[PDB]
Design a protein around this ligand. Sequence first.
Ligand SMILES: NC(=O)C1=CN([C@@H]2O[C@H](COP(=O)(O)OP(=O)(O)OC[C@H]3O[C@@H](n4cnc5c(N)ncnc54)[C@H](OP(=O)(O)O)[C@@H]3O)[C@@H](O)[C@H]2O)C=CC1
Ligand SMILES: NC(=O)C1=CN([C@@H]2O[C@H](COP(=O)(O)OP(=O)(O)OC[C@H]3O[C@@H](n4cnc5c(N)ncnc54)[C@H](OP(=O)(O)O)[C@@H]3O)[C@@H](O)[C@H]2O)C=CC1
Lengths: 298, 298
Amino acid sequence: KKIRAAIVGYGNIGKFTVEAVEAAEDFELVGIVRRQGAENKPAELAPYKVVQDIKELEGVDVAILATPSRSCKEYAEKILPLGINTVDSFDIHTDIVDYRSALMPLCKEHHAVSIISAGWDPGSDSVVRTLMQSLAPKGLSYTNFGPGMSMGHSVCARSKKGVKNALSMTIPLGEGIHRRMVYVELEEGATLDEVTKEIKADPYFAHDETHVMAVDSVDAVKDMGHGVHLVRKGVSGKTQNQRMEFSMSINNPALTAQVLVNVARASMHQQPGCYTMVEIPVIDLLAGEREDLIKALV
Amino acid sequence: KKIRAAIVGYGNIGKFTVEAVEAAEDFELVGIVRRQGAENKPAELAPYKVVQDIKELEGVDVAILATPSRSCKEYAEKILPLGINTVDSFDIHTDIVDYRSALMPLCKEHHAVSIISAGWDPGSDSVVRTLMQSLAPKGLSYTNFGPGMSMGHSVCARSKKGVKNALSMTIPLGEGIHRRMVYVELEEGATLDEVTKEIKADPYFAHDETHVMAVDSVDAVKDMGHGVHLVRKGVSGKTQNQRMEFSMSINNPALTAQVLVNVARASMHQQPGCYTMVEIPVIDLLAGEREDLIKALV
Ligand SMILES: NC(=O)C1=CN([C@@H]2O[C@H](COP(=O)(O)OP(=O)(O)OC[C@H]3O[C@@H](n4cnc5c(N)ncnc54)[C@H](OP(=O)(O)O)[C@@H]3O)[C@@H](O)[C@H]2O)C=CC1
Ligand SMILES: NC(=O)C1=CN([C@@H]2O[C@H](COP(=O)(O)OP(=O)(O)OC[C@H]3O[C@@H](n4cnc5c(N)ncnc54)[C@H](OP(=O)(O)O)[C@@H]3O)[C@@H](O)[C@H]2O)C=CC1
């Protein structure tokens, strides 16, 4: 009747994934899996079992991996043999094919389902981008992120010398082109130019319009808001100039969470194997009877 | 290697469906099926066999039904026993559940696939609307058509007394609310008021802001341009005020055609049965190896 979900990692996503599972009337939250188990359990996790190994939790249908991207395959390969299903928001566009081909046979062998790269991008947007391609298979598509924070670029800026803290904003200038607004807390000694030169040198910044500013508090300029403008102009049949846009103004980690819950729900209805969200019927993402949902949405 | 498609009906969709099949390098056009066979074969159908019964055409994988909506079930029930697959743009939102559960067993018994209600709305938009619902399952969605021509309302206006010709434009006023701009050729004798009162009385117009104008030529004001603004404001997990928009500026029948070709291609990869487009992985709509497509779009 209800789906028994365990969350692996209580990072930013984890926090919102609890909120998203708490809100799904068709879900039970078995427990959260942390490196540090129950220790210093935060207030909002009061009413849930927290452990160090998923093996400690009982009758788990699906593991939502709120892990880093580097950590996803390792934890998946670990959690599948147990017969448990694994959704994740793995976000390294370039590796997605190999990570898929990896879990593929392991999923089948253990009669269980892995859905991978299931956030809003990749995930949600990957579906829209694919539908859009189909609507006019000749022409050009453009993915336009922000304004929003970039966990990757934010990190790749902290990493540089003179940089105590740093947040990199990602600003869309259209046609897949972007602007980087980096805000920094200077370590005692170093100057804005040293740091600026040091950032712009890195491949993550060297090919994009970058502006580096110094601020008292990075935390005082942070906000989990984010967006996207997906755009296609192209040809349906041989009829030119067909135009379509998809846009979001969303809370990034809040939405990534909700999609993970959705592909968790969706894994309970697939032939054992590994799946990107473009391989999943979008109706499986929702709660309810196919007939009732078709009546409402088609 | 290639998919052998027959088109049933050389109406406006039919015309564009040829153009769309001509453009799919993974398709072969076996023939067009008309009531009136080859008889006044139009120039652009020169190089294709045209017949009166699909039985005349040979080694057909999939029948694209470019028929009216009233006619779809009849032609499907006819073409399935022959072992052939049936895609259609059946567009009566209310009947879609019954039409599905009708073909369902018939498709299975004959180990073959029917995809139904596969235009841009329903079809394309049915997918986006469903994904959007998933992204924030609490709140409100709004489908906003036009500006574009309305075949249904256009017809329901010709039907009224004093109306020689009539075209009904559909104008979005947001939040699912619409305006009807009806343009009429008066049958010599009748007056604009009589006709106006006579239209607005009808359920198709009585609940919508309607403006009725009299014009010299209806054909002089026609255009197959059209669009939609799909809109959801709602809640991801328990995070409020998540916003997302999907919009098109397209040639209506041109796009309906291209989607039909897409669900024709998609039917070649499904367990026998009846499917709405929300039941089909969006990747199946495209030509190519899953790996190549995932590399590009996810
Ligand atoms: N598709 C999309 O658009 C989005 C996808 N993402 C995905 O989410 C990931 C992280 O999201 P977020 O929650 O904000 O990140 P955080 O860094 O805040 O959280 C990661 C958590 O994973 C757990 N963890 C498990 N194993 C390890 C390990 N070996 N090293 C470090 N931490 C580990 C930790 O929690 P604990 O110690 O309690 O176990 C940690 O808090 C990204 O790497 C990306 O894959 C990110 C944003 C949106
Ligand atoms: N999803 C969406 O928004 C859209 C949906 N549609 C769908 O497409 C349908 C038809 O559009 P379109 O092709 O422009 O319409 P037309 O009226 O221009 O074409 C209908 C064709 O159906 C064939 N036909 C076969 N049997 C019959 C019959 N008994 N009575 C009438 N026609 C018959 C005919 O082909 P021939 O004359 O050569 O024999 C005829 O030309 C709509 O009713 C709707 O279901 C339309 C466009 C957009």
